Design a protein around this ligand. Structure first.
Ligand SMILES: Nc1ncnc2c1ncn2[C@@H]1O[C@H](COP(=O)(O)OP(=O)(O)OP(=O)(O)O)[C@@H](O)[C@H]1O
Length: 450
């Protein structure tokens, strides 16, 4: 009924903030938009019920200023805090503290975060859960080469020496023979201490031509948990996602209930609460666990489209104590979805291109979703990311979804800055892409990338 959150803090900014603001307004939740002195002009900022300047431009003082944010709630009387994605969404000390200050944290518990935060641990947990993992050391590599030489041989080359601190493409090394093993473990151990401040490392097999399939889940922490089909995010350029889609072409419903059900089991097993995502590498009709994003993702709209489920409301629902409103058997995968991220960037340098938007026009029409905070005379700052929007198109089928997307990319007008739009069009036109089922290496190589 109405055992809903009185007022929550939107501990974020940009498109994500707007989106969250939107779901708040539908549930009647009051909103407090905390922002940085430079985001005083954010769309979402202008629509919030209450606003608060937490700091200066630089993230470490604003968006990552834990106290500032936490105090912002105090003064406002909010009951919860929504991290969105990418700042502290995966920061357990912030979750910890939010809890400790007596606020609700729109996400799982800190314990769960740290748990999934450490690859090694993560892996062990899921191995246990029945979730399919990459074969590797099933532990931190030791220091005596002999055994390590043995791990490898067993799992077989090539391999990959991965640290447990995550990072994001940073802290990884590919070994293909016994000769480079030693160096690798070492190079990698060193890259980790410095970077994440955790030299711990694990070994696993390296996958050549796999796709990136991810499973969306939801848990209430009451015993319920559902999977919302998969998403294909193989469209990468330097680890940066560019094109997401649901469902994943080539994925049979059977397969879909396979990895899903176990993903659902794992959630329960770990006492998972809220939204979250299971990242899988996919080669040879086989799934392999890479990690777990204990949060809402940038690409969630695609999934809300093919399912009709509103992720954010659900998070908000779980957060307020409610049980899952939906049952697995009520979840039905319908049509096809494709999201193109829109970036403020230089198609040559791939470098951020900040500036003010002079002219702007958004595409509309059937099965077209525009997710962005930009407008005309809006100034995109240099401080934060390059993403300014999400262009999501729906269709009774893939080919339809694609067609719409082409049109949409054209009606789209963003003047006064550099954007990745041309690129999007080009992919849309990608004959390989039209066929589909391309690997995470496709973009990089077509881009004439070395
Ligand atoms: N065992 C593996 N075999 C092949 N490719 C792998 C393997 N493990 C990781 N990768 C590649 O490394 C990339 C980064 O892996 P991972 O998701 O673990 O990095 P991260 O540091 O956690 O990234 P991010 O924070 O950006 O999500 C993957 O997208 C994938 O391209």
């Amino acid at each position: 009924g109405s055992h809903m959150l009185d007022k929550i803090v939107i501990a974020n900014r940009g498109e994500i903030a707007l989106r969250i603001l939107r779901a708040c307004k539908e549930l009647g939740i009051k909103t407090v938009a905390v922002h940085s002195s430079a985001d005083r002009d954010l769309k979402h900022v202008l629509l919030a019920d209450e606003t608060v300047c937490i700091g200066p431009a630089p993230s470490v003082k604003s968006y990552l200023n834990i106290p500032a944010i936490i105090s912002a709630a105090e003064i406002t009387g909010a009951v919860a805090i929504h991290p969105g994605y990418g700042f502290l969404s995966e920061n357990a000390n912030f979750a910890e503290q939010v809890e400790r200050s007596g606020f609700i944290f729109i996400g799982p518990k800190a314990e769960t975060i740290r748990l999934m935060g450490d690859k090694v641990s993560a892996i062990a947990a899921m191995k246990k859960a029945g979730v399919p993992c990459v074969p590797g050391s099933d532990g931190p590599l030791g220091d005596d080469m002999d055994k390590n030489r043995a791990i490898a041989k067993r799992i077989g080359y090539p391999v990959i020496i991965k640290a447990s601190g995550g990072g994001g493409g940073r802290g990884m090394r590919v070994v293909r023979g016994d000769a480079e093993l030693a160096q690798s473990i070492s190079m990698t151990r060193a890259e980790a201490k410095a970077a994440f401040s955790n030299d711990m490392v694990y070994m696993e097999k390296y996958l050549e031509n796999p796709r990136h399939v991810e499973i969306q889940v939801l848990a209430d922490g009451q015993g319920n948990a559902i999977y919302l089909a998969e998403r294909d995010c193989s469209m990468q350029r330097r680890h940066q996602k560019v094109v997401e889609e649901a469902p994943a072409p080539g994925i049979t419903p059977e397969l879909r209930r396979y990895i899903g059900e176990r993903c659902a089991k794992a959630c329960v097993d770990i006492g998972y609460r809220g939204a979250g995502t299971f990242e899988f590498l996919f080669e040879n009709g086989e799934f392999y666990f890479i990690k777990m994003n204990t949060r809402i993702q940038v690409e969630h709209p695609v999934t809300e489209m093919i399912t009709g489920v509103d992720l954010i409301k659900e998070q908000l629902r779980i957060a307020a104590g409610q049980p899952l409103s939906i049952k697995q058997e009520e979840v039905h995968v319908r049509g096809h979805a494709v999201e193109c991220r829109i970036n403020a960037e230089d198609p040559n340098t791939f470098l951020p291109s900040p500036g003010k938007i002079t002219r702007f026009h958004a595409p509309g029409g059937f099965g077209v979703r525009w997710e962005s905070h930009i407008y005309a005379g809006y100034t995109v700052p240099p401080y934060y990311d390059s993403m300014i929007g999400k262009l999501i198109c729906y269709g009774e089928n893939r080919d339809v979804a694609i067609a719409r997307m082409k049109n949409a990319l054209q009606e789209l007008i963003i003047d006064g800055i550099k954007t990745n739009v041309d690129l999007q069009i080009r992919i849309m036109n990608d004959e390989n892409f039209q066929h589909g089922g391309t690997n995470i290496h496709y973009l990089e190589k077509k881009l004439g990338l070395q």
